[PDB]
Paper text:
A HEPN (higher eukaryote and prokaryote nucleotide binding) nuclease Las1 and a polynucleotide kinase Grc3 assemble into a tetramerase responsible for rRNA maturation. Las1 and Grc3 are highly conserved proteins and have recently been identified as core enzymes involved in processing and removing ITS2 spacer, which is a key step in the synthesis of 60S ribosomal subunit. Recent studies have demonstrated that Las1 is an endoribonuclease that contains a HEPN (higher eukaryote and prokaryote nucleotide binding) domain responsible for rRNA processing. Grc3 is a polynucleotide kinase responsible not only for Las1 nuclease activation, but also for nonspecific phosphorylation of the 5′-OH of the 26S pre-rRNA produced by Las1 cleavage, providing a signal for further processing by Rat1-Rai1 exonuclease.
To elucidate how Las1 and Grc3 cooperate to direct ITS2 cleavage and phosphorylation, we determined the cryo-EM and crystal structures of full-length ScLas1-Grc3 complex at 3.07 Å and 3.69 Å resolution, respectively. To be noted, the crystal structures were solved by molecular replacement method with the cryo-EM maps of Las1-Grc3 complexes. Each Grc3 GCT binds to a groove in each Las1 HEPN domain and extends to the ribonuclease active center, which is formed by the two HEPN domains via dimerization. Both the crystal and cryo-EM structures show that the conserved catalytic residues Arg129, His130, His134 with two copies from two HEPN domains form a symmetric catalytic active pocket. Our crystal and cryo-EM structures exhibit that the Las1 LCT is located in a groove in the CTD domain of Grc3. Notably, compared with CjGrc3-bound CjLas1, ScGrc3-bound ScLas1 has a more compact catalytic pocket, which may explain why ScLas1 shows better ITS2 cleavage activity than CjLas1 in the presence of Grc3. In addition, His130 in the ScLas1-Grc3 complex active site and the analogous His130 in the CjLas1-Grc3 complex active site adopt two different conformations, which are similar to the conformations of His142 of CtGrc3-bound CtLas1 in two different active states.
Author numbering:
A (entry chain C), B (entry chain D): 2 to 167
C (entry chain B): 65 to 139, 165 to 301, 303 to 618
D (entry chain A): 65 to 139, 165 to 618
Amino acid sequence: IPPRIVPWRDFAELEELKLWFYPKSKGTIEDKRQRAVQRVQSYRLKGSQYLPHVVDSTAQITCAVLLDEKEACLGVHQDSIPIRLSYVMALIRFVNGLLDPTQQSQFAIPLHTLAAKIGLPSWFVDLRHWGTHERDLPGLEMLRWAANEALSWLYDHYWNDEELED
Amino acid sequence: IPPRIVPWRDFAELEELKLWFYPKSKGTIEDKRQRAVQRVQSYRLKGSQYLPHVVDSTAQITCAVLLDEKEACLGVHQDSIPIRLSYVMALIRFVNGLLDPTQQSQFAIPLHTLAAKIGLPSWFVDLRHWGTHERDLPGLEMLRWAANEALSWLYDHYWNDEELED
Amino acid sequence: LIDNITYEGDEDETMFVGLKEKQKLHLSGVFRLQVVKGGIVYNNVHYNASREILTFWHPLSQSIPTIDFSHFAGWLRVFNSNHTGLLEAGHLYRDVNYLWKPKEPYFPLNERTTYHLLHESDRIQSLSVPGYWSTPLEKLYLSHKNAAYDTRIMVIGGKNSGKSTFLRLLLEKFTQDIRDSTTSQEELVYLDLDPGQPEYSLPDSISLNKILSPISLGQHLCQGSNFQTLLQFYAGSSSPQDEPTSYLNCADKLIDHLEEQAFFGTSLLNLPGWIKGFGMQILNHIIRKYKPTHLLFLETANSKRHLDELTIPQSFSTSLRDAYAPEVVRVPAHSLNHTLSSRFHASQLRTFKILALFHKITQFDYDFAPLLKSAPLQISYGKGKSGIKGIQFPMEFQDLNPQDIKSALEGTVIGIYTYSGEDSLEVKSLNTFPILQSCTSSSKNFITLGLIHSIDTSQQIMNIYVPPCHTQILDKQPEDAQWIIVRNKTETPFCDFLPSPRTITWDDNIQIPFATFERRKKLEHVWK
Amino acid sequence: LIDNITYEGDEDETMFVGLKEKQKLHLSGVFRLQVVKGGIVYNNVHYNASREILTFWHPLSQSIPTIDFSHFAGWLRVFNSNHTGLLEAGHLYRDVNYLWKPKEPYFPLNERTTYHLLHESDRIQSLSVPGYWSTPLEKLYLSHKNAAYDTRIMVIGGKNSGKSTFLRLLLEKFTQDIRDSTTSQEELVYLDLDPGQPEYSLPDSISLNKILSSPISLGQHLCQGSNFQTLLQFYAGSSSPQDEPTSYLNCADKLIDHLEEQAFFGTSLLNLPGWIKGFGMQILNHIIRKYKPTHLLFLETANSKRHLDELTIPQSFSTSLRDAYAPEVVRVPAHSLNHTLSSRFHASQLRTFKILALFHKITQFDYDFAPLLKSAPLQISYGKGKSGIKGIQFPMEFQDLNPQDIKSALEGTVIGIYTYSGEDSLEVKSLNTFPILQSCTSSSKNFITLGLIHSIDTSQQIMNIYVPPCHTQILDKQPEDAQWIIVRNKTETPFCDFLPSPRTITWDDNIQIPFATFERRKKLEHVWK
């Protein structure tokens, strides 16, 4: 087994990210997802080619989820479209980095059965063209639902699943 | 010449929209570029089937451009991950709405040919993948210069031209 | 087959039909039957008729169930509809002119007749009940009477699956059974949860409805007046995808009304298809909530691969403490056999329902002159307020310029609401438009749709169109009641927004807003 | 067809060649030849036998040109170049092990020879010179002497089209004309604005650098040649300009002006990044009016050329200078090489070799390819004032990089060292004792060398760091009062340097390797590519 370069200084750092992204039974004052996002921001700084896609997507979806939480005076110019703009790339980049890489080739297994193989439910295949090709952006509620479903999916399949096959 | 439903009441309400979108003023009272987006946002209320995509995208790109211009201890200077996502959304939807409707123009013709027909720069075609099929989002200034280019192209080829063929 | 004799007059142009041996009768349109002798078989059911009137609705949108003759014993009939201005619906909206009658039939057209014979020449689809499709349904009826408990049915299937026909058949034969059974008070309740294809509900709406003689069948495009609406909510869109949990919240509120009234007996509901997409997640909560005694699936060669995990994961054993049962069956059915549209797209048919709603004087009367001719009954919105106290917008359009609001509302279909339970008004004022702030307001009553004509800020009033059928439900309502406007994405019909010559001459000086006549500039194409 | 004159020549493995033989000479490696009698032809260029030494770099990455014989009249020759450690890079980087020698050569390989003979047996091919490129090239010969004025050539062509080879051919063509013309003091000034496949510049960098007429070097030395002296350089920090376009253009604008600062008159060269399909149609338009190209060239032809037609015409101007008052356009084929452009040597595979060879470049021509971890990194005290480092620069993003996570971000990353020139005032924000440029800008700084951060001690406020030993002691020549800036940009540290093979370096087993893990990657953590 050849060593791979990983941004984190230790596996304990990855456990700490796991705890940070998904708070245990408390999210009021101990939310601590802004700082986990700031950590993955450094992971991007060291090298983006080093960072696994699942960690990148967990950070990016959480970026958008923390983005939509702004309810303080004075009233901001934002008309709630930037949040809807942000979720669409968060989720599309998420679903694309699971299907496309390692490795897209001239012979490619169809996307739906790729999702079935990796365990991704087949409704995630659709949100690639759900946002980019549809005329109007999806409702903020539907995007919120998709993001909170995707984060749970990553927790179930990568963060808290110890399959080492790849 | 069948009648068309359009959200604006008359030409004098769309003529001022063009002036608002391209004021040539940096700031203060003369700049009314937020108001143009707040008005296209009301156009989406009655629509969005009457609102042309050339105006929907002019408003989305401008909303993102206004989004990254926050300079008072708030907004973007704290974290600049939302802006890249918003530019990617605005530019991808702008490209898609013209290049790939598959209704107005003949189907199966390659995208570069349609970009030649409508006069779109050839590099706007590659703006589709841009942030969707690559590991890392494009650089922040690379996005700004492309958003400004798209707005200039829209102003030159739609808000000015006297062609009524379509 | 040789056509029967024709009896003109005195009214309704009633026709008498005689078929040698057993023949499939093809009749299209709205018509009433009073079968003196013999047995009628409409889709392998028995309708023995003795001086009872049976109203039939046979649009060309769906495959018309042919009327079969059976013993015993035979060998006014097909009398005209009580509805007056439904057919002239082709005049206003010219994409629906052939819904009741074919285009170029091998019969002379008549303005008096609202029914038309179809002697296989029009090549239209009249495919009858499949045998294979009958067996799974026949099993539910052997379980309808010996269940000894309330029976709740769900049916699952996307567009083009044939879900609506299956529920219709269930409805007619259930209502035949309850009439046969004496004395049965188990009045079945239809719980329309499908804003995509309304049945028994207002456009872009969700409705729990009581289903009650006279006989009506089978597909009446929500115009049947064979049902009484117990409760309704305004989803405001043709797809729950736009507001998933809001639609789920409305469905939860509607289903809970069933236990609120403590109803026991037959009850049905159709969920939106959602065979492929977020439907896997959307159905896992409503199956859990409604406690369905019979699940039904129609995907077959759709294919069925997408909608598979729901039956195992979402079943959760039996939700009901008393029913303690579940059913999981699959059937193969692609109806109709021909193209699903049948020259009637779902979006094309959806416009007809709105148009007919806005033009109905009452259940049995229709007047399809443009509402621009009709007076727009007005309401005063104030800061008090008396009448309209709040205006609601979808969440993403919650930061909007006060100046543009006046232009946004006019010419848009809206939902009128009553505050119902007494609480704080909680409304924000923008250019004298009381925009409802923070949304919420869970406790509301949805009355009807409305089409806003104009707004007078100085007089603080709104000239607004409501269907004449509801009047005077709006008037028969307490004066101090608070009234709310919810403008969600409901599409106003184009032929109704601006009329044309040969309908209204208009005036030369008058300039029509929101409509332009100049040829569209290049690149003004709307994204589709 | 038979090998001849395999002379041992004791140390350096010198050998002689038969000249009048009808078989063209083909040779590969880093060598140097001194011809005794008779004319030689390297890429349709004639070199006399006037006992002058010529260094030759013949990597297998590019198609290797043959050496022809020509009258008159013939029949130390070829011998090892003074590069001791360059050939052993294969011991450190496994991929580049075959850069100078073929895999199976059908020839007795000798470890003591930097040059190897190849005769039609190996998979490689010799490009020679295409006839199609010949005519415009020999015409552009005639526009040097007869011009009697400054002739600046700007050449555009996409990756794998072969702009580098044409520009090389042009460069030796001008250098030969300089040597044999008296008095010709118009030494070439190359202008590498391409960080993707850079020649004559630092990794992920941009450079305006003078080209020395002597000693003779042909043709492609993978930036390891000694024939160029750097006048000015800037750290783009990215493999592609598209990451920082406006910065890149600014980095370009500062280079061109330097050429007027020297009041340079004579031939100058330039290669832009290809960008045949994409943003490029605009980027060139910024400096086509700025560079004043007297001889603009195009290469793509059947690329197709559908993209570089409308922009080049809009960019072209009738007269952008009083003296030149002209512009030229020419199109030539792009097929180079005939075989696959990669030739088992991808651009990303060769950029890594260049970065690796930089950090192991001891002196002008001596390389020590032992892993960096054996070498002792040097230290600078970044502080509050400070004297060691005044500020650390990051791209526009990553600005909320919180103070307690900065340190582990820096370690193991290639950086660009900068000196801050005459300062009106300092601009620094201190986060966990790390000085960071909050507003960026600061255009007055000048780039010195790349660096690889090894470790950071927050207590002592020191910064262990590796710099190429070639630059040392250029860092020491700088005044002590001069401020230092550490710029982080997306430059990929070589994998072998970051963690060497266990055979190369033996560590204590208890010592933990911080930024690397040995566990099998969990399903499914895969890097998006």
